Amino acid sequence: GCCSHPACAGNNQHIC
Numbered sequence: 085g086c087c088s089h090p091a092c093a094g095n096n097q098h099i100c
């Protein structure tokens with residue numbers, strides 16, 4: 085969902 089977005093994965097390097 086969000087992780088598929090550059091903005092999400094950006095700060096979700098460890099989150100996602």
